[model samples]
Target chain A: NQGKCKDGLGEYTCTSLEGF
Target chain B: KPKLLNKFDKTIKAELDAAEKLRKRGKIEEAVNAFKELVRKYPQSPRARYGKAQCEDDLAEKRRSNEVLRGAIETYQEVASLPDVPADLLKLSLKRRSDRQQFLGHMRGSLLTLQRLVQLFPNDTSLKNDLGVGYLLIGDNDNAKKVYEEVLSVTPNDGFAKVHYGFILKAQNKIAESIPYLKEGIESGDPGTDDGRFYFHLGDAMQRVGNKEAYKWYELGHKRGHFASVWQRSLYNVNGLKAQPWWTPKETGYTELVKSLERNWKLIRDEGLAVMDKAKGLFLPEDENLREKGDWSQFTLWQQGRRNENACKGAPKTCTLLEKFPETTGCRRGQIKYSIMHPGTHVWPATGPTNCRLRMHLGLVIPKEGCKIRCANETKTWEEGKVLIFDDSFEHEVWQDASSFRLIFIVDVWHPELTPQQRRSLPAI
Candidate 1:
């Protein structure tokens, strides 16, 4: 799954974590 | 002193081999240092300079950091500009510098560097492609289109050129024309990356033409995680655009059929004219007095009687193909225009659904020169009996330079995959 902030469209700081 | 010189030469070779081994082994950081050490010791050696640049490039590839990328570009430029650099290494360095400039969004700079490279290696399509991309980025599409057109003429199977040209056409609102080029590119293992912008554009085009196939491409791009935002937004669920059944899978092969028609140009022309004569002709109804000046009068060929006339004309099979082309209505005869340049024609950028129409022009009275038709990134001069196929919804325009009428036998065909029922329901206009 991926995680994203409310940084607006195309201006996001996001993170993804694979199967834990 | 003689013995010392021999040992120095031996040490340089040994270190050079070591650096190469490290690079081959994927120890990019260690390889970079090794090459850097060699360059420091043999400052005037072309081999040392080239090696150092290669290592820096590799390191940048591994790290992909802006600082490292910038440093790599500088080092590559150094090697590329050096008078003593060998031909191959000089070419490599210039190519790497141009690539880096593009990645850094320095499009004009990239174009400048690549333009020089293209001039040096005039036959190198890869260099031309890079230059074309630079032109595209800087909004110099006319020049970019010319570059791609030249590249395609020389290397007809170049997928990169095809896709970019398709993109240019799509931008020009020649959606029907652009889609095939885009599809050809995708089919050829190009724009090959999972997160490539090519897939995004492909999906966009498919969606405009109302093709459910757009979902697949959009999904592929979304999964790749590059430009994830763009792809994510394009998803049917996210973008708030409802899905529609537009295209069916094509099970028939038209390669032979298309070739047969192309080969028998006389037969096709006869059939086309026969259908046009039987069908109603609609005038363009323009108020311009230039018609008296031998300006080409424009007219549309149609098989169906009217918009309210839902029944098929039972015209020739070829005429039927035009009516049902792409499995939709919006039928017309091939456009004919007399030589007219003033108020130069241009089509606004546009797109269509998956049911997009395929515009095929069988040149009847092609000019020797001075008449050019453009859709998207494609600019073409027609010859007698040449067959041209493209999506019409894309932006398109034409200009005639000579004072001669340009004639073409035009038809639209349903995009392959429409069912019989779908074809029957299609409007004829």
Candidate 2:
């Protein structure tokens, strides 16, 4: 629906999960 | 007048419970007042002081103000410093204060509280583990390694520490040593086995070492509640969320969203360029291993519904353009950014972390040749001022020719098939 082929690409459950 | 007894602590808990009830039942400030009176009368009672501090903390939560939160954290510090306080109560005060400080962005205070807790309670394996996570978060891997190593030596049978240390071992690239500890830790049954993170940690290391059986661990991880089925392992995920390889714009219900953004394409692109130009090296490179060969960098405008306030403020019009698209900007698992890829780069094929979202790119600048993106079996190219949308949960790859750089504005929207309730409930991974 939109533009040209482009460039560049790339925790709370993480914390306080498992009782942390 | 109260006297000390092993039984006396139980009575304090009941009184604190009663005071806590007042806040929950709608008289939040009244409970604070009531606890204050008790604290005034029994100045030395850690229970009374802690109850009062707890009410203050609740008041902050009720009123939703960080200033009040700061006051509450101060109250907790006084409670922790009280003479003749119980070690358990002191630990409780420090924990409360530390997390509140963490919430308020006071890393110094948060870390000091954690250090004090471990210094005062060295025998408590949990506190050491807490410190380890704190260190890991701050990029102090050596300290994380030190704390985790110490805990394992002391509590070799502690399952939580066992897996945690195994995780650290893997982080340090000692995958060989990581596997057995994770296996034995899960079997030890000291609790926390239901954690999805534990399963993924074990699976990733095993898979790295060429154990194909690791596939089942990923299935179990999501089956129990975590992320990408096996190949991606992104950590935060929702299961059964309209799994797919690609999506058409019309099907995404973001048609209007795209229409508007495309209409404002020039504004968005200009603002994005301005923001990038103003930065002191604003573009940061990918830490992920996806890029096989190329310089890929990104400047995030929003993270998990969290704005890069500086970026947003600099590009006011663009943020306003994005304002109406809350699903894209605020999706807990979403990120809004400008992706910059310099020429001569290749991103390896890799599955994304979750099926919960469809990633969209609005082309800012694209050379007619030497650039393409692929998801599953279909490959596509971005046209300047046009858009591309795809499900990242499937394996994807990218390449750019050595002629010119490419730039695209990106946003992640909840998979369109998800119901409103499902969209609202899933948290950031």
Q: Highest TM-score among the candidates is held by which one?
A: 2
Chain B TM-score for each model? 0.45, 0.68
lDDT (C-alpha) at residue B51 in model 2:
73
Candidate 1 lDDT, B173-263, residue by residue in tens: 5766878887787677654323244665666667656677875765665556533233233211112222221211222323543454467
Residue B287 displacement in candidate 1 (angstroms): 29
True contacts kept of each: 0.00, 0.03
Q: Which candidate should be chosen as best, given lDDT against the real structure?
A: 2
Q: How does candidate 1 score on lDDT?
A: 0.54
Best DockQ among the predictions, by candidate number: 2
Compute the lDDT of residue B333 as modeled in candidate 2: 63
Q: For residue B172, give model 1's deviation from the true position in Å.
A: 0.9
Tell me the spans in candidate 1 whose CA falls farther than 4 Å from its real position. A1-20, B1-12, B21-37, B54-71, B190-196, B199-429
What TM-score does chain A of each model score against the native chain A? 0.14, 0.14
